[PDB]
Each structure stands twice: as C-alpha cells, then as structure tokens.
C-alpha cells in the first residue's frame, strides 16, 4: 500500500518509517541564455548538491548503503525523555524534528566521532593479525 | 488562415510574355516552396515547376524548361511566374500552390489560388 | 526451477537520444581568435579509442539526426557572438556617387564610389574615396545619373568583422558527455539510411571542418570502395542528392588582385577599413579544375546513378536554372575573401551508353549567408594576394522532374540549404543514451538472515 | 581477452554479464561565456546527472558495491515465459531490455519495496538483542 | 579534541588518521549573468566533481563507504624503505605525500586490478553454490 | 486602424498609425449591470462579515 | 586556524589571487558604465576662452 | 574625441572603495602567512588557514 511522494507526512513515525523508499526516488530526480535556462540549470545544480550533502553524512555515519542504520550512540535524556511508545506510536517525524532540532547539531557530532572516527581504527588493529 | 491572392486576368500576344502573382498571407513566406500548376480548359491538371522563397532557387519542369522564370519578391511575400513566347495551347488558369503545414515534405497541395 | 530477479549494473543497452554535444579540438597553437575554435574548446584527448560492437546491427537515418540541427545552430551562434564586439557601419549608408574604376577601359565590376563620412568629431564631416565592387552596390535613381547606396542599407544592417578572427575552418570533434555515446557505421557500402552491419562507438566524432560551400563540397571526407548517391528520396525530385567521391578532385582558385587597406576613421575607436587601389593588373578571380580528372570522376558518378534510374538511360547536366546570388554560384570563403563562382563549365554533359577548366568568379563583400534577413557582414579587404588549393568532394544536385517519360534525366546543381553540408560528414554518427540497468531472472535470491 | 566498451553488445547475456566491470568504468570518466563553454558546463552537469541516477538506484536496492546482486523478488511468469537456457544463450541484453520494457517500471517498484524496504526494518529487530 | 579543518596538518601521520571526519566534511558544502553568478554557479559543480572524482576511485577500490580501508595490494619496497615507526612516529602526510607522489599512480592502478577486479570474480563463483 | 511601415534606417523599420478606414469611435467596454450589481452585492455581504 | 609544524613556500609574484583580482575590478568597471550615458555626441568643436 | 569613446560615469554609483573579502570555494584553501619578518618569497614558519582574506 503506498500513497505517495510524502504520503506519510501525516502518520505515526512508526508507519512512516516503512515507506523511506518513495521519498528516496522522488529526492534526486541559438543561445540558451534564456531565463528559464539560467534557472533549470541553477535548480538540477542545487538539486545534486542538496542530495550529496546527505549522502556525505551517510558515508560519514557508516550507513552509506542502507536507509535504517544503527548505531553506537546512546541516546542522552536531555535530548527527549519520551518513551519508545509516546515517540513511534503517537508523534509524527515533523513534530520530532521541530522537538530534537534543537540538538540535530550535537547528536551529527557524536554520530561521526563516536563510531566510525573510532570503528574503522579498531577495524585496523583487530584486521591487523 | 493561408492565403493565396494572384494576379487579374491576362491577354497576350503569342511570343509575347506575361507574368503571375501571387501574394501569400497568413504565415511565413520564406518556410515553404511555391509551386505553381496550370489546367487548360476542359483538361486536367500539371505542374509546371516550384520555387524556394530562401534562395530562389527553382525546378522548372522538363516540358517548359527555358520558357517559364520563377522569381519571388521577401519584402512582399509574393511569388512570381513568367512565361515567355506563348503558344496557343498556354491558355489556362495557372494556380500557384503550397504544401501541408504537416508531414514535414511536399507534393500534397492543401492551398490553393 | 524458483526464479528470482536481480540486478545487473553495467548491461549493454542503448536507446536513441538527442543530446547537447561539445566541442573537442586538437592543440593548436598559435593571430588566433578564429569564430570556431574561439577562446577555449576542449582539448582532444592523446590518443582516441574506437572500439568496434561485433554482431551488432543498429537503424541509421542521416536525415532524421539531430546532430545536424545543432551543429547549424553552432555555426550561427558562433557567428553572431564574434561579430557583437566588431565596428557597425550604419553610417556608411551615404548616398555614394561612383564612377569605372576600370582603368580608362573602353567597353567591369567594381565601381570606384566617393562620399562624405563623420569623423573623430562629430561637427567634422570628410570625403572619403574606396573601391567597391557592383555586386554590393545598386543605383539610388535608377533614373540613372552616377550615384548609388550599398546593396544592404535598404533591408539589413551592416556590421564591419573585425580583421583579427580569420574565417578558415579547422577540424572540430563534436563530443558526447558521459553516459552518452555515439555509433558509427564503418560500413563501406552504407547507403542514406537503413542498417549497418560494422557499427563501432566512440566518444567524439572525427575532425569535422565546418567548410560554409555551395554545390561543391571543399575540403570533406572522401568516400572508401565506391562513390555514393545519398538522398532522403531518389523518386523525390525536391531532395537533393548528395554525391561523396572516392577520389579527390584537386581545385586552385586565386584573387590575382592585389589588393591594399585604406582604414579611414568614422568615429572614436571606430575604424572603417575600405578598399584602396589596387597595386598591379585588374584580373578577375577564377578557379582551375582538371579537365582529366573531373570527367574521369563525373564518369564514376554516372555509373552509380544508372544503378537507380536504369542500366541503360539518358543522363546529362546542366547549369542552375534557378535562384540568384550565392544558390547559382559555388560560393565559399578563400584566405577572407568570398568567391562567387560560375560552375556553368562543370555541369555540362551528356551521357549515353593539362587542359583544365577555368570558372569565372566574382567577389562580394557585404554577404548576406545562413537565411539572414536583417544582419549583414562587412568583409574587410583582405590585403595582398590570395591563393588557396581546395579537394572538391561532395556535390549538392538536383533533378528537374516533369512529364518526361523516363527517357532522359537532367541534373542540376544547388544549395538550398546549408545544413546539407554537415550531413555529408554526419551521416555515419548516431547519438545514443546508456542505460546500464538491466533486470533478469535467475535461480539466486538474496539472503533472509 | 576483452573487446571495450559495450563489446559484448551483441553477444548472449551470459557472455556481456562477464565483462561488466568494462562498462562500469566508461561511465562517469577573458570570459567564459563561449558557447562551447556553456556546452562544457551543460555536459558536465548532465553527466553526473545520469550518473548519481543509477547509483540512487543501487543504493535504495542494497546494491550499492557490488555489480551483481540478488534479490527477494520473485519473477513473475507475466513479464517473460523464457526458460534459463533461452534467455542467456540466445538472446542479447538489447532485445532482452526491449521484451521487458513494458514491466521494468513494476519491477523496480517492488525492486525497493519487497526487500531493502522491509529488510532494513528486520535488521533492526535481528540485532535488537 | 578537535582542532579545526587541517588542524592536523604537522602532526604525524598516526595523530592525523585519527581525525579524517574533519577533512570530510569540509569537502563537499533581472540577469543572474553577473560576473560573480557565473563564477558562483562554475565553482559549485567544480566542487561536486572533485568530490565525486574520489568517490569514484573508492569504488573500484572496494573502500566507498569507509574511511580506512585494508586492500590485497603488497607494500613494494622501492616505493619507501622507511619502517612504521619511521613513517608513522616521524613523518607527517604533506612530506609522506611527497615522498610517494613518484608512485601514486602506480598504486592507484594495482589498488584497483589486485583487488575489486579479481575479487567480484571470485566473489561470484564462491557465491555460486 | 491600418499599419503605415516607413523605413527610418537600415533594417530599422517603424510601425506608425495609418488612417483610420471608416468611423471615428472611441474604444468601450460594456459588462452587464444586472450581473454587476449581483456580483456586487455578493461582495458587499462578505465585507459586512468584517464590518458588522 | 593555525598549523603548527607547517613550513609553507610562498610567492608573492606568482600568485594567481593577484591575476583574478585585477580581472575582477576591471570588469566591474565596464559594467557599472554599460547603462549609463555615453557622451559620443560631446565630440563637438569647442570654442574656449581664460577665466 | 580622437582615440576612444568617452562614458559618463553615472552620478549614483560611488567610488569609495569599501573592504572586499576574497575566499576560496569547497575543496580548496586559502593559507595565510603570519610571520612578521616575511619578505617577497621563501617559507614561511608560521602558516595558517583562512577561508576568506
Ligand atoms: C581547405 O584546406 C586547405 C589546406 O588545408 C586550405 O588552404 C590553406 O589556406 C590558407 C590561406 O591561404 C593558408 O594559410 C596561409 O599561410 C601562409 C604561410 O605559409 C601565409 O603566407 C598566407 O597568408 C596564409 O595565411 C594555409 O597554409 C593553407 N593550408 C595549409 C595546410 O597550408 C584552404 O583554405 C581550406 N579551405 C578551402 C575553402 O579550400
Ligand atoms: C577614384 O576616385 C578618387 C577620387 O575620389 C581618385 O583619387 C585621385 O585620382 C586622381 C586622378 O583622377 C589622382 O591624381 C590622385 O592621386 C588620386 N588620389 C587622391 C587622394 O586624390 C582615384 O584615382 C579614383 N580611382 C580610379 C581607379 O578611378
Ligand atoms: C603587392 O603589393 C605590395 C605593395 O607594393 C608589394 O609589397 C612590396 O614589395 C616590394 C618588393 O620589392 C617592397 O620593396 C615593398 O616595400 C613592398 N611594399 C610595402 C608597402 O612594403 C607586394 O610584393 C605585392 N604582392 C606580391 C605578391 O608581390
Ligand atoms: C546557364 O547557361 C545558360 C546557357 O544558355 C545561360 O544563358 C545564356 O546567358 C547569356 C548571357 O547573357 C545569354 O547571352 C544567352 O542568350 C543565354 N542563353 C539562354 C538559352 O538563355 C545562363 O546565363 C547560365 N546561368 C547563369 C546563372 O548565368
Ligand atoms: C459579449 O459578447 C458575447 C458574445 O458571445 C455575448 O454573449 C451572447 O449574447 C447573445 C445575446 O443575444 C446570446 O444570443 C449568445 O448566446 C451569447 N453567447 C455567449 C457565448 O454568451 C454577451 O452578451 C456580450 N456581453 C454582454 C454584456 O452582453
Ligand atoms: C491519519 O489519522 C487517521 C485517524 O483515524 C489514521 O487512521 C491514519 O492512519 C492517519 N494517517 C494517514 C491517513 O495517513
Ligand atoms: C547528557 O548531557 C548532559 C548535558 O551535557 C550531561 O550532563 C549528561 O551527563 C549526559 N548524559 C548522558 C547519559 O550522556
Ligand atoms: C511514556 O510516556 C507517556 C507520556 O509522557 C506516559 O503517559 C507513559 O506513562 C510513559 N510510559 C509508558 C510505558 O507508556
Ligand atoms: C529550542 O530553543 C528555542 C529558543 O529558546 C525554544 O523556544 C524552544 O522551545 C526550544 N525547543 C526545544 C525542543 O528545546
Ligand atoms: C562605365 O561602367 C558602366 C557600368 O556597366 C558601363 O555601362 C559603361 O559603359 C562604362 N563607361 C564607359 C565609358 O564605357
Ligand atoms: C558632400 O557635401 C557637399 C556639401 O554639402 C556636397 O556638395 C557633396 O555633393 C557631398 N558629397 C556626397 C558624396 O554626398
Ligand atoms: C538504402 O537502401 C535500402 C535497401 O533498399 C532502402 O530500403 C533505403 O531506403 C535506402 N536509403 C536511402 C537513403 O536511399
Ligand atoms: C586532398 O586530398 C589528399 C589525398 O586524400 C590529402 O592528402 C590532402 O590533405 C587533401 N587536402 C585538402 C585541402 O583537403
Ligand atoms: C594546383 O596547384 C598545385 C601546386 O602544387 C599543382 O600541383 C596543381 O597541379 C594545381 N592544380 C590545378 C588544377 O591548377
Ligand atoms: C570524357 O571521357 C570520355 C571517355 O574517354 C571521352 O569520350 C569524352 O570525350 C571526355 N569528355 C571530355 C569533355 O573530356
Ligand atoms: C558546353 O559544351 C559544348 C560542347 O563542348 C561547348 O561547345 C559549349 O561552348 C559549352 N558551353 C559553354 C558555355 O562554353
Ligand atoms: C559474434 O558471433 C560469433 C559467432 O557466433 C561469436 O563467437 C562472438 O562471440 C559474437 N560476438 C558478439 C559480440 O556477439
Ligand atoms: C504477477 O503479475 C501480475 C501482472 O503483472 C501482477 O498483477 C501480480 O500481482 C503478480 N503476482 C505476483 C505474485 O508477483
Ligand atoms: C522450456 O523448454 C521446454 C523444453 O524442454 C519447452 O517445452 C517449454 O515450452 C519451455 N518453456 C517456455 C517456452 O516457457
Ligand atoms: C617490486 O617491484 C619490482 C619491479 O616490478 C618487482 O620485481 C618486485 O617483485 C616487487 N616486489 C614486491 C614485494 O612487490
Ligand atoms: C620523484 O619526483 C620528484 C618531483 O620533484 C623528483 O624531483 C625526483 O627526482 C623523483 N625521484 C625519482 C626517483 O624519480
Ligand atoms: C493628414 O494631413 C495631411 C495634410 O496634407 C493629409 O495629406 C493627410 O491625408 C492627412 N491624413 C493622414 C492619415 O495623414
Ligand atoms: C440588484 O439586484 C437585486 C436582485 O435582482 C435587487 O434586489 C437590487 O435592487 C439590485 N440593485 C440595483 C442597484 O440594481
Ligand atoms: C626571503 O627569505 C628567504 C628565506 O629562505 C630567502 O631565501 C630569500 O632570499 C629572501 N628574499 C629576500 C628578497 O630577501
């Protein structure tokens, strides 16, 4: 049952979840000086820059092929103290990210440093016999 | 809304010449050949030769080759036949004819004079 | 006997696609500033891989591409964006009064036309003499007296080319972007359109040197094994037919004129550059063509054209019967100058069953090519004197139909178009996308765990 | 022993699947207002356009790496009847992506859905303890 | 302990692989005809291809989505005769990059032919049954 | 109204008024004024929502 | 940010900042002059006098 | 009169010139050097980065 391009907007994060490959589609895609030109070209560039931004931090994160990653980050309370209930099952992405994008900033910075700036050193020495 | 206006009737000596009008209107002279057919009374229809408004250049048929001269005026839009010596068979109602907007090729004569 | 999709990245397949190709040229350095290579093209790469598709067979069709649209709509564009920055002469539409420049001859083309011309200052006014020629002049009465006007100021406007681009066409390799590529027909014997048996990819096409011609096709791409009768038709006497040779006729066309540059200043900046005197003898510009080779040639042409219109047929050629100006006449640029050349001694032969060839010539220099109506460029005189030696190639003919009952066939020459000539060296290039996503069924699927 | 790029065009889809790795690798590699520098600009653009187009495509499919991938989706008798011996020793991947033309938009749908779409989710719950 | 974008550039190769998240990040992120629009608009896919020009080759190196990535490609000793502690206790990477920069392509051609081209092909067949 | 071209420079070409071939009237709309005032008074018991 | 243990060549003379910079101001020039009124007509004779 | 056109300067713009920054684009850097002794050329001890100047 798929209803769209944002079709889960509106729903639980829990049913949402289980449609992250319909936005993922709809994400990427004599003299031509003309208005319309200047901006279909200006909008495919800041398309592919929009869509590598977050595949940066995907490569970064350790979680480059896959669209639900976990992680070695815990979760600190001062970021929300919701249950897994009150979150999954009663709140929508749109009012969660209004609630942690406060702290979006400094759970990136841990995503990257705690696990694969530390992982793929550890990958090195436990590889290395 | 082609439109195709030639010139009034004619009477000429025969030897002598007469020259052909035709006005264009209603689209872009200079993208589509003129053609230009004659019909003698009681007979059937032939096609004497078309002209590229662009160039000018011609293709006069075999049968009036160096009698007949195709000239087209771009300020006007109007294309012109002229033919010299006249015999006594030339009388006939000569149409100047164009191609279809469409199918991107000639020989399918939708405007007439 | 379970069946499961899977994914297969890089599978052979390609679809018909029209896309923006770019420019590639070789490293040629060097006065520059010529219109095509311009300021900065892609370099070529060192060494280029043709890589050959064994048992493939792909459609062709020369007169559907759409590489030629865009390659006319280069050459155009390349022509405006050097002519922009050039010296306007708008106010060169004085009403001349000429006089023969012919030297005191008694019973020429080329008229010798004083007028008044603004100065530095504006309040200052000067009279100025220069040569011109009467194909780019028309009398003023026509009542008559001896005054006249250039042949543009009633319909265009006139724009002087700078004297620095040179207008001599050097190889351009037209180019695919990635994920694009490009087919060739290597077939020896490929005719207009249909299948091609041998078909390689590549990533640009070869040196392409836009010659701007008419009827005769300079410095082109010979044809291998036999000459070829190209035609979007042969039963349609509209088409035109182009003709590629497999071997070269040699053509040597002069300007024995020596000419010299008479730069007058009509403005701050502004400079006009006239035609003075010219040092030497008046001789008219002509061309020789082998008498030997262009009938041998015209010969070989013949016995490919009866193999479309009878064994055994009349076929003879004649000159242009119709048009004016540069459709009637071999047109094309030599050292900066523009011939206009007579080719009523070439196409005059009929055929059943060291003496060369001189063509008179005229030369313009207010130009009107490419259909357009309302810009007109001003050739500035190309000082000294000029010789180029050409490979006539390809021809651009013609039929003239009528009620003839198969009996004789006559060829004519011309040049309706210009988009002709980048067709006799596009027409074995095919543009074409990479889809490289290809499902299958197999017996693998992938792992629950 | 190997032909080039698009070689095996031609050959049997068994025989072309062995060199994918060929094409794999020929399909990425005062003023400049020329308009063979617009060209320049528009082609680069484009190529990376089309590009980052498949590789969107094998990441939402957890085929990112690898250049031949199995799936969870069943073949449906539907979109070709063909035994194995008659697909991949006798026919080509031209006229084998013509035949399927009319169901690949299917395809790739259930493509992302059926698998990388609920594996990630049972992934999830595998490594949850 | 974070030093900023290059903070390591003096340090020695060992104290400066430890930090490769900051680099990673820093790489990526009537008339529009102006001089500093065309410039603008040339800069940004001049910044997205470089990016993907390294990505590329961490693709047929195997290495897409990690930042220390182990290879089958043996060290020749005519390349550098230095030990680990030499090169990594006693050389940074700017004069490490120098040293090496004679063989940096010969690398780069092994790095992809030793491994990914040889491994798919065995990744295959050991897959096969 | 006619088009009168005069030539004012090479290529320049200006459009001018020509003669106008019959009467002499000034241009007009019209608009039914049953629909108007309907129309109208559609309007006006909006406005009294934000106006008592 | 400042690079410890970082020892830099530099060259004042063959910096390409410089090149770019005098191209940058230069065409500003022009296009800060391109709408506005070019005097070509004040080429008129003059005819002056002392103050 | 006699050598190049003349233009009016427009009597809105100014002519003060105003501090300009100039910085380098994504995957590039601009490296400042901060010795005090420096000269024209030659290394520079004391090296550090900006992004604008
Ligand atoms: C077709 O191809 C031929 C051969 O490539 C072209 O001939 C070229 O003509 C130009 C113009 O004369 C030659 O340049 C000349 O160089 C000499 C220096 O030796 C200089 O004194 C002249 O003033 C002129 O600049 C050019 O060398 C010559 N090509 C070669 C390879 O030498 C011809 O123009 C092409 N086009 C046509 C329509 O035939
Ligand atoms: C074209 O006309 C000009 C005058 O506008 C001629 O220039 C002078 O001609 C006389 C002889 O008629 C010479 O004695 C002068 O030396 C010429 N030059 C000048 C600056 O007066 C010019 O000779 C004419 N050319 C032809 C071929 O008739
Ligand atoms: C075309 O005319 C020019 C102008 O006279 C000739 O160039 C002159 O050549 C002689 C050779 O004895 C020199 O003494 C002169 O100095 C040259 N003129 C100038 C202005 O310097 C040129 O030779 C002629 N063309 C040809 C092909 O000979
Ligand atoms: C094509 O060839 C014909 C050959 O006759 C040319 O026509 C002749 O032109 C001369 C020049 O005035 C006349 O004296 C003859 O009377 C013409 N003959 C005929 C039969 O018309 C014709 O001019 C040539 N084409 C062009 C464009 O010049
Ligand atoms: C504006 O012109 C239109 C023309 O269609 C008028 O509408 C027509 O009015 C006549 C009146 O007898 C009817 O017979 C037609 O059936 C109407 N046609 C349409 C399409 O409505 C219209 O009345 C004119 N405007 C006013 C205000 O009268
Ligand atoms: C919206 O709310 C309704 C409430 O009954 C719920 O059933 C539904 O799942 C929600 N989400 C939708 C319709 O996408
Ligand atoms: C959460 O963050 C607060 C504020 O920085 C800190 O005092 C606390 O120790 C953190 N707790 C955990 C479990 O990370
Ligand atoms: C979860 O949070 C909600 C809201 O804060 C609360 O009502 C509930 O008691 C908590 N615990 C569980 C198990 O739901
Ligand atoms: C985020 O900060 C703003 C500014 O103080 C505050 O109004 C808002 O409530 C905060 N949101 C959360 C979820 O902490
Ligand atoms: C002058 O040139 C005209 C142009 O054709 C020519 O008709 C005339 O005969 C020439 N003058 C003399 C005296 O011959
Ligand atoms: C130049 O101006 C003078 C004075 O008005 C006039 O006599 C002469 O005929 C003019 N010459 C031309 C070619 O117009
Ligand atoms: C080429 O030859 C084939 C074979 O008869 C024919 O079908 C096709 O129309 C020809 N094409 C042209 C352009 O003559
Ligand atoms: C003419 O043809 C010969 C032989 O094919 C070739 O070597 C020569 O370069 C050609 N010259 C031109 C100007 O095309
Ligand atoms: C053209 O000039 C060349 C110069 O080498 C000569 O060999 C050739 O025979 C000439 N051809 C003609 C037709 O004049
Ligand atoms: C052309 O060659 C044929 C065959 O030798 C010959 O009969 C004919 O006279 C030649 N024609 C010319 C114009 O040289
Ligand atoms: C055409 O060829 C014939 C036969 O050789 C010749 O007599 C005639 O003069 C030629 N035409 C011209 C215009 O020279
Ligand atoms: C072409 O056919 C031959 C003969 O069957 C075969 O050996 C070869 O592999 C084929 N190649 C392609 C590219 O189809
Ligand atoms: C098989 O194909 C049909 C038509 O394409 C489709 O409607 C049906 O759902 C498919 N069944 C399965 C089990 O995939
Ligand atoms: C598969 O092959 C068998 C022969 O072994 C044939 O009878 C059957 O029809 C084939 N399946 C198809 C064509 O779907
Ligand atoms: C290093 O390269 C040389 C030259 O190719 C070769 O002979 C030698 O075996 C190589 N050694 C290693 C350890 O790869
Ligand atoms: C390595 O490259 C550097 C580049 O400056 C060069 O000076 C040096 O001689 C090269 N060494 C060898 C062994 O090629
Ligand atoms: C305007 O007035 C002139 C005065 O002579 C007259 O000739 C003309 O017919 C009038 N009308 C137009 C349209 O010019
Ligand atoms: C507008 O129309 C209504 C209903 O037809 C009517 O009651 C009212 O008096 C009209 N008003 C005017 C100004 O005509
Ligand atoms: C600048 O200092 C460097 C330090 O190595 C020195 O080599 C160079 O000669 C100096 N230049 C001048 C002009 O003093």
Same mark, same amino acid.
């Given at each position: 049952?798929?209803?769209?391009?944002?079709?889960?907007?509106?729903?639980?994060?829990?049913?949402?979840?289980?449609?992250?490959?319909?936005?993922?589609?709809?994400?990427?895609?004599?003299?031509?000086?003309?208005?319309?030109?200047?901006?279909?070209?200006?909008?495919?560039?800041?398309?592919?820059?929009?869509?590598?931004?977050?595949?940066?931090?995907?490569?970064?994160?350790?979680?480059?092929?896959?669209?639900?990653?976990?992680?070695?980050?815990?979760?600190?309370?001062?970021?929300?103290?919701?249950?897994?209930? &009150?979150?999954?099952?009663?709140?929508?992405?749109?009012?969660?990210?209004?609630?942690?994008?406060?702290?979006?900033?400094?759970?990136?910075?841990?995503?990257?440093?705690?696990?694969?700036?530390?992982?793929?050193? &550890?990958?090195?020495?436990?590889?290395?016999? | 809304?082609?439109?195709?206006?030639?010139?009034?009737?004619?009477?000429?000596?025969?030897?002598?010449?007469?020259?052909?009008?035709?006005?264009?209107?209603?689209?872009? %002279?200079?993208?589509?050949?003129?053609?230009?057919?004659?019909?003698?009374?009681?007979?059937?229809?032939?096609?004497?030769?078309?002209?590229?408004?662009?160039?000018?250049?011609?293709?006069?048929?075999?049968? %009036?080759?160096?009698?007949?001269?195709?000239?087209?005026?771009?300020?006007?839009?109007?294309?012109?036949?002229?033919?010299?010596?006249?015999?006594?068979?030339?009388?006939?109602?000569?149409?100047?004819?164009?191609?279809?907007?469409?199918?991107?090729?000639?020989?399918? %004569?939708?405007?007439?004079? | 006997?379970?069946?499961?999709?899977?994914?297969?990245?890089?599978?052979?397949?390609?679809?018909?696609?029209?896309?923006?190709?770019?420019?590639?040229?070789?490293?040629?350095?060097?006065?520059?500033?010529?219109?095509?290579?311009?300021?900065?093209?892609?370099?070529?790469?060192?060494?280029?891989?043709?890589?050959?598709?064994?048992?493939?067979?792909?459609?062709?069709?020369?007169?559907?591409?759409?590489?030629?649209?865009?390659?006319?709509?280069?050459?155009?564009?390349?022509?405006?964006?050097?002519?922009?920055?050039?010296?306007?002469?708008?106010?060169?539409?004085?009403?001349?009064?000429?006089?023969? /420049?012919?030297?005191?001859?008694?019973?020429?083309?080329?008229?010798?036309?004083?007028?008044?011309?603004?100065?530095?200052?504006?309040?200052?006014?000067?009279?100025?003499?220069?040569?011109?020629?009467?194909?780019?002049?028309?009398?003023?009465?026509?009542?008559?007296?001896?005054?006249?006007?250039?042949?543009?100021?009633?319909?265009?406007?006139?724009?002087?080319?700078?004297?620095?681009?040179?207008?001599?066409?050097?190889?351009?390799?037209?180019?695919?972007?990635?994920?694009?590529?490009?087919?060739?027909?290597?077939?020896?014997?490929?005719?207009?359109?249909?299948?091609?048996?041998?078909?390689?990819?590549?990533?640009?096409?070869?040196?392409?040197?836009?010659?701007?011609?008419?009827?005769?096709?300079?410095?082109?791409?010979?044809?291998?094994?036999?000459?070829?009768?190209?035609?979007?038709?042969?039963?349609?006497?509209?088409?035109?037919?182009?003709?590629?040779?497999?071997?070269?006729?040699?053509?040597?066309?002069?300007?024995?004129?020596?000419?010299?540059?008479?730069?007058?200043?009509?403005?701050?900046?502004?400079?006009?550059?006239?035609?003075?005197?010219?040092?030497?003898?008046?001789?008219?510009?002509?061309?020789?063509?082998?008498?030997?080779?262009?009938?041998? @040639?015209?010969?070989?042409?013949?016995?490919?054209?009866?193999?479309?219109?009878?064994?055994?047929?009349?076929?003879?050629?004649?000159?242009?019967?119709?048009?004016?100006?540069?459709?009637?006449?071999?047109?094309?640029?030599?050292?900066?100058?523009?011939?206009?050349?007579?080719?009523?001694?070439?196409?005059?032969?009929?055929?059943?069953?060291?003496?060369?060839?001189?063509?008179?010539?005229?030369?313009?220099?207010?130009?009107?090519?490419?259909?357009?109506?309302?810009?007109?460029?001003?050739?500035?005189?190309?000082?000294?004197?000029?010789?180029?030696?050409?490979?006539?190639?390809?021809?651009?003919?013609?039929?003239?139909?009528?009620?003839?009952?198969?009996?004789?066939? @006559?060829?004519?020459?011309?040049?309706?178009?210009?988009?002709?000539?980048?067709?006799?060296?596009?027409?074995?290039?095919?543009?074409?996308?990479?889809?490289?996503?290809? /499902?299958?069924?197999?017996?693998?699927?992938?792992?629950?765990?």
């Amino acid at each position: 049952v798929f209803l769209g391009f944002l079709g889960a907007a509106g729903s639980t994060m829990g049913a949402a979840s289980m449609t992250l490959t319909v936005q993922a589609r709809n994400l990427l895609s004599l003299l031509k000086l003309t208005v319309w030109g200047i901006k279909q070209l200006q909008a495919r560039v800041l398309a592919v820059e929009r869509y590598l931004r977050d595949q940066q931090l995907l490569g970064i994160w350790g979680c480059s092929g896959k669209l639900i990653c976990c992680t070695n980050v815990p979760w600190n309370s001062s970021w929300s103290n919701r249950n897994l209930s &009150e979150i999954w099952d009663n709140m929508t992405w749109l009012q969660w990210d209004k609630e942690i994008s406060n702290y979006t900033q400094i759970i990136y910075g841990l995503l990257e440093e705690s696990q694969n700036q530390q992982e793929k050193n &550890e990958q090195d020495l436990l590889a290395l016999d | 809304q082609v439109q195709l206006v030639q010139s009034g009737a004619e009477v000429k000596k025969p030897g002598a010449s007469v020259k052909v009008s035709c006005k264009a209107s209603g689209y872009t %002279f200079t993208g589509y050949y003129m053609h230009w057919v004659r019909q003698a009374p009681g007979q059937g229809l032939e096609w004497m030769g078309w002209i590229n408004p662009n160039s000018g250049g011609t293709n006069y048929a075999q049968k %009036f080759q160096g009698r007949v001269t195709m000239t087209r005026d771009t300020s006007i839009s109007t294309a012109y036949m002229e033919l010299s010596r006249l015999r006594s068979d030339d009388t006939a109602v000569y149409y100047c004819a164009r191609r279809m907007r469409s199918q991107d090729r000639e020989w399918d %004569f939708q405007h007439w004079g | 006997e379970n069946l499961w999709v899977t994914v297969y990245y890089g599978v052979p397949v390609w679809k018909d696609a029209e896309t923006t190709l770019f420019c590639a040229s070789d490293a040629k350095a060097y006065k520059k500033h010529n219109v095509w290579a311009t300021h900065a093209c892609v370099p070529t790469d060192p060494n280029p891989q043709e890589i050959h598709l064994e048992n493939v067979t792909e459609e062709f069709n020369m007169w559907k591409n759409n590489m030629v649209e865009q390659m006319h709509t280069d050459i155009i564009s390349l022509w405006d964006q050097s002519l922009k920055p050039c010296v306007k002469l708008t106010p060169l539409c004085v009403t001349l009064q000429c006089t023969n /420049v012919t030297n005191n001859i008694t019973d020429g083309e080329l008229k010798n036309c004083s007028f008044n011309m603004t100065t530095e200052l504006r309040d200052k006014r000067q009279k100025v003499h220069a040569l011109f020629y009467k194909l780019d002049i028309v009398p003023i009465n026509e009542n008559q007296n001896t005054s006249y006007r250039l042949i543009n100021c009633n319909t265009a406007a006139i724009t002087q080319a700078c004297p620095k681009v040179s207008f001599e066409p050097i190889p351009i390799h037209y180019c695919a972007p990635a994920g694009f590529a490009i087919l060739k027909c290597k077939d020896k014997k490929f005719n207009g359109t249909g299948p091609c048996p041998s078909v390689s990819t590549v990533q640009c096409t070869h040196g392409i040197k836009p010659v701007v011609s008419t009827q005769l096709l300079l410095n082109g791409s010979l044809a291998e094994e036999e000459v070829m009768i190209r035609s979007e038709d042969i039963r349609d006497n509209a088409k035109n037919i182009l003709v590629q040779f497999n071997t070269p006729v040699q053509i040597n066309c002069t300007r024995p004129n020596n000419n010299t540059r008479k730069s007058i200043r009509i403005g701050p900046g502004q400079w006009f550059y006239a035609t003075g005197d010219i040092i030497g003898d008046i001789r008219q510009a002509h061309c020789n063509v082998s008498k030997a080779t262009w009938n041998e @040639t015209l010969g070989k042409v013949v016995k490919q054209l009866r193999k479309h219109f009878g064994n055994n047929t009349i076929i003879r050629f004649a000159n242009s019967s119709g048009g004016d100006l540069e459709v009637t006449t071999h047109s094309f640029n030599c050292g900066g100058e523009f011939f206009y050349c007579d080719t009523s001694g070439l196409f005059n032969s009929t055929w059943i069953s060291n003496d060369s060839i001189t063509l008179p010539c005229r030369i313009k220099q207010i130009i009107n090519m490419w259909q357009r109506i309302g810009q007109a460029m001003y050739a500035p005189p190309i000082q000294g004197v000029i010789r180029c030696v050409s490979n006539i190639t390809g021809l651009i003919l013609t039929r003239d139909g009528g009620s003839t009952d198969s009996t004789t066939e @006559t060829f004519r020459p011309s040049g309706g178009d210009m988009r002709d000539n980048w067709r006799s060296e596009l027409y074995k290039y095919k543009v074409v996308k990479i889809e490289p996503l290809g /499902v299958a069924p197999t017996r693998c699927k992938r792992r629950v765990v």
